[PDB]
Amino acid sequence: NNRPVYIPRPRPPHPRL
Amino acid sequence: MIGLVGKKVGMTRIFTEDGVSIPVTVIEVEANRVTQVKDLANDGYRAIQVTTGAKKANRVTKPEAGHFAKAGVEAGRGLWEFRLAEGEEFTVGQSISVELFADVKKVDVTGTSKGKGFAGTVKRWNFRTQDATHGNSLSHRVPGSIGQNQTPGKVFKGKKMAGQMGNERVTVQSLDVVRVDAERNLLLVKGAVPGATGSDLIVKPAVKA
Amino acid sequence: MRHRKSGRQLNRNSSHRQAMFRNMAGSLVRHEIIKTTLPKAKELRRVVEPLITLAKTDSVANRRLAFARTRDNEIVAKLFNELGPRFASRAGGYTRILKCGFRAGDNAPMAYIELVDRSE
Amino acid sequence: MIQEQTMLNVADNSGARRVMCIKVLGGSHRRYAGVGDIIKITIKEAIPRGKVKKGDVLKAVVVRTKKGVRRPDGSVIRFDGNACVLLNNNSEQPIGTRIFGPVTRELRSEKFMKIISLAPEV
Amino acid sequence: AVQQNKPTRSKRGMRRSHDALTAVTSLSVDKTSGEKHLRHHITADGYYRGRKVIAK
Amino acid sequence: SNIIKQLEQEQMKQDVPSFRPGDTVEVKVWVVEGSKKRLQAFEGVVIAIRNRGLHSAFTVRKISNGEGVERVFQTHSPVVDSISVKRRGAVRKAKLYYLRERTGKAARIKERLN
RNA sequence: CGAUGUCGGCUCAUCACAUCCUGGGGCUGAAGUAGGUCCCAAGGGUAUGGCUGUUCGCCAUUUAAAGUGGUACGCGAGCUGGGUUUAGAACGUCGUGAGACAGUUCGGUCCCUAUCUGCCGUGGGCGCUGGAGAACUGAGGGGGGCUGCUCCUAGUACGAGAGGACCGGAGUGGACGCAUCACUGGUGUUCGGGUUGUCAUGCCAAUGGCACUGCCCGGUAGCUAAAUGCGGAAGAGAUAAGUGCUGAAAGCAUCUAAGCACGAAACUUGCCCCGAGAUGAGUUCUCCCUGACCCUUUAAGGGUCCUGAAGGAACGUUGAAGACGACGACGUUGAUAGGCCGGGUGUGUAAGCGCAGCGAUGCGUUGAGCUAACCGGUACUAAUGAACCGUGAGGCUUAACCU
RNA sequence: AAUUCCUUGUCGGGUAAGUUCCGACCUGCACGAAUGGCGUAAUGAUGGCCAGGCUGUCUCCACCCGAGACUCAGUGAAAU
RNA sequence: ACACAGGUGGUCAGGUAGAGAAUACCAAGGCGCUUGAGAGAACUCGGGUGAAGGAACUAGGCAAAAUGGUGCCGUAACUUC
RNA sequence: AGGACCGAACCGACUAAUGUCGAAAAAUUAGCGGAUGACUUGUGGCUGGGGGUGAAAGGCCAAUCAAACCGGGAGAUAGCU
């Protein structure tokens, strides 16, 4: 109903390069 | 040949004249009364059903009371039967004493092992624990991997996992009989036998002669 | 697996468990009847009834030993003067537990524990 | 109960005083050595004038253990330290001339006659 | 860790089949006062096995 | 149990002298070498006594030439023949395990003189 | 590419056989021990450390052997993050430079409460047909299957000597598995004791609270290993490679075409465990129920009154049974639990009083006092009389014996 | 060598065993003198290596004390 | 964003032991932190102890264990003294 | 005397574990560094976005920084989904 005002910032655990 | 039903009574050791001490389990084998004899004509196999001990008159149910009364045998706790070896015969109401173990040297003891309840893989299957340090996180006694990958796609049946441990019947075989005491109804066998004190045990001559 | 072990833990540490029985033993002696949960009442039989047994014979050593438990001079006075002689011919079983339904707050099985007395 | 990396004293007078067990012989994946089991050791410090120098690998036999030994009647023998005797790697043959301290009789295997003879007690 | 398809109401009811409660259906009548009470429990008024035990 | 207790009682020996921890004791034990049987003397200090009836045992510590030796004897075993007491240590502890660390002049104990 | 985490290590494995060991054989430039090569065989077993992130490899020392491969180069919703592979910094080199370099160093966030399948455990429901309580048969399934050394044979056979068997028997080990607590021990914050600081009970003495159980010393029962017993089989059946007997086709020869023999840790059984939901639902023993009215769309039908047995469940006391269910014992015609009495065990000479000493303290009473889970007893307390579920002789067809 | 591909350069020390570390040689791919060179006592939550003590890190885990997990009563989410 | 294990400047600050505003136990004073009751499985978290061995673990002694105060004696290489 | 030493308050955050739909949009527990100084802190001011400030990391500038936030050009453009 209400857009979360905060969006958590994730991380890249797995480079997958 | 037939076995006998006894009750485990603690443990002790016997000191021999030469000095060595023999740890012995004491089994109380009182008179075993035959309640039913089976034959190939009726049951398709030959066996004798025996009873031991005593039961409260008001505790034995009517179906069991009539079964004992038919054989003229005083009510006992539980019923066990042993297959015959074709070389011996028995009659209903006959009493079997521990003296039959006088001429034997090895016996097999069967009983219910002590119940450990729900046990982990380390205790149940002797799994090796993982490192307690060096970064380990919440995986000190966990089983670890249980399968390979997509290619199987499943966990194989018979996998070793945590679960109920103990409280099943197990047999310890080829136990030396140390002493037989007919008048006092004792059977000293070298070693340890499954189950705790007061648990019912089945003793038969060793089959791995 | 606690084979053959005895003594309820009651979700308390040793020190808290010891104090709680110490107080609630003293309450039972003072009032001669109290209402508690069934598990607590059962475990009290093993700490209160030994005290009455100690109070059977009055001596300085017994008085000091009795005082070391319950740490109350009123309770020690109550013992050795009333409980002692009252149970002189009684061979144990000085208590009695009567289940009294369930506690409304959390549905704890509750029970009354009371000395075999108060027949006035 | 002697396992790899264990310090042992030397009962004989071969010149070695402290040795390290580096292997337990007599079986694959064997864990620890008993009262009279042969082990492979390395000398960690010896007499300069002795016939055995530091950092040499040769066999040894345990004669005393802190854990102790069990007698058939239930008795046990325990010591305040672990001791061994040096060997020759081809034939057992303790190289020492005398051995100090008590030695248990568990070494009577129709072979350690030299060890028991030199033993001041038992 | 999370479902791939939402279980149906059929599966929900099947799981809940074991959640049904059971009635005591074991109410005893006091010897003297004739008051229904749970077995091995004192009555509401404070009777047990006939004799009054609470006196309150 | 009654059955067990009766079974152990018949195996007892009534010639067990009364001794306490800290008492110097010489215990005579049987030794067999193939076919010959000899008496060996073990003298030391009783540092712990275990009372369990037929399973009762005591341990004796002696200072040998270099290191101490601790032996645990089963009181009622046929191996032990006789137990004799020389000194009466005036200790007040059931288990004298602290004597292991001590040595020399610190390993001696007083005399009960009772 | 609207995301399949990609090297090693740990834990846990499973399969193939192109077999490393153990087992059975052919040939040998196979005297014997020890080998070489090939065939059959996958039952079990198939290292520990130093260096490096390493797999690998080198090295050290063991073993009967330290097998080769598949499984997302098995396994990160099981663990780690050392290497590689973000952002900092430096060196060498390339570039005027920003910067770059399978060039090298120092440092550097690894999320998930399991719906489904699967797997390890454990229950409820119904079925198996009158119901109930027991004991079993066993279809079927699973577990286990490893082996060294010493001695005898014998110092025999063999061999110029040096060296040194086959087959068979006995003893004693390693690793692995099951069980157990009698012994040796660990633990034992529920037992006893010592002791430091402080607060409190009027004060001394004596005790309690708190300081990681305040710090320690022992230690009961349980659980437990390092402790103590036991196990791997023997035997039988059918075989693999192989060796054969007799024997023609093909007058001979030939293990094969007919026929008859042996022949391995493989296969089936033997040993242990689960097991009749084995819907193909089995067998045996014992126990309980054998009263009346009506109705119709007269059916293996429905309704009412009276009886509800065997047994079960529920509740309580509980257990060496247990996550909860379940399982076992007991409920007064009673030792199920608690307490109590006695004993044992453990700790170790209580408090009080008396004596000696200026005192700390010591001695006597005193191996005292206190003792958890242990052992043998004892109805002292709590396990209530009852209620609840479960019925009233159990279908049709056919066959065989009485009638 | 914080610089070295070939490379775990060669020899020695240390370990039973040392691609790490320490010392020496120079065949310095591609050190070098204020984008400073070589030493340097003291200092460093700085990198590497070795030794004594110490230990459950480990061989190999066992028991115990508490908080969750489990059952009952009340309240009652989330990603998908 | 919450009746949120966080953050928020200054003043007073007692007794016993202690160098001390450290630390332990307390006074004045204030609180038991707004879900409880049972059971006493695996496993996780925070702790205690441990036979024999003592880094064999591991990328690495990570983490744990250990040392720990006062007074006296004594104290090396090197050094900018 | 000392950008001196040990160590609380105070300031900071080297290691480990827990916690990752947490008590918490970086915390807690046990250790750890500085702790008379180039220290720390209260109150009030000044520096404004191609600008500030920076013991210099492309760090910080209201939980947002290799060019903050708000409104407008604006329905920018999108051979792409």
* Residue from B127, B199, B121, B117 nearest B166 by CA: B117
Distance, CA of D84 to CA of D106 (rounded, Å): 14
∠ CA E14-E20-E21, nearest 5°, is: 170
Distance, CA of D82 to CA of D64 (rounded, Å): 5
Q: How far is B184 from chain F (nearest CA, A)?
A: 9
Distance from CA(B123) to C1'(G78), angstroms, rounded = 18
Distance, CA of C50 to CA of F82 (rounded, Å): 44
Could you write out the DSSP letters of every residue in B4-69? EEEEEEEEEEEE-TTS-EEEEEEEE--PEEEEEEE-HHHHSS-EEEEEES---TTTS-HHHHHHHH
Where do the H-state alpha helices sit in F1-114? 2-9
Q: What is the DSSP letter of D12?
A: B
Strand order in the sheet with C33-37: C33-37, C109-115, C95-102
Can you give the CATH number for the domain in which D70 is found?
Answer: 2.40.150.20
Nearest to E40 among C99, C112, C118 (CB): C99
**Which chains contact D through at least 3 pairs of Cβ atoms less than 8 Å apart?**
B, F
Structure tokens at C6: 């005895």
Overall number of domains in chain E: 1
Distance, CA of C48 to CA of F13 (rounded, Å): 43
Tell whether C56 is covered by a domain. Answer: yes
Do the bridges between strand D83-86 and strand D7-10 make them parallel or antiparallel, or are there none, so unpaired? Answer: parallel
Structure tokens at B46: 């030959």
Method of determination is: cryo-EM
CB-based burial label for C36 (10 Å; 0-12, 13-18, 19+) = buried
* Residue from F73, F88, F108, F98 nearest F23 by CA: F88
Can you give the CATH number for the domain in which C58 is found?
Answer: 3.90.1030.10
Given phi > 0 = left and psi -120 to 50 = alpha, else beta, which region is F88?
beta
Tell whether C71 is covered by a domain. Answer: yes
Tell whether C5 is covered by a domain. Answer: no
Distance, CA of C9 to CA of C1 (rounded, Å): 14
Tell whether C2 is covered by a domain. Answer: no
Structure tokens at C80: 């050795």
Residues C83, C89, C94, C99: is their CA dihedral positive or negative?
A: negative
Structural domain of E5: 1-56
Overall number of domains in chain D: 1
∠ CA C74-C80-C84, nearest 5°, is: 125
The closest nt to A6, taking CA to C1', is: J25
Structure tokens at B150: 């997509």
Distance, CA of C2 to CA of B198 (rounded, Å): 18
3-state secondary structure of D24: strand
Tell whether C4 is covered by a domain. Answer: no
3-state secondary structure of B123: helix
Spans of all domains in chain B: 1-209
The answer to whether F111 and F44 have CB atoms below 8 angstroms apart is no
Nearest to F79 among D73, D77, D102 (CB): D73
Where do the H-state alpha helices sit in E1-56? 9-16
Residues B58, B63, B69, B71: is their CA dihedral positive or negative?
A: negative
Structural domain of C103: 13-115
The answer to whether C25 and C94 have CB atoms below 8 angstroms apart is no
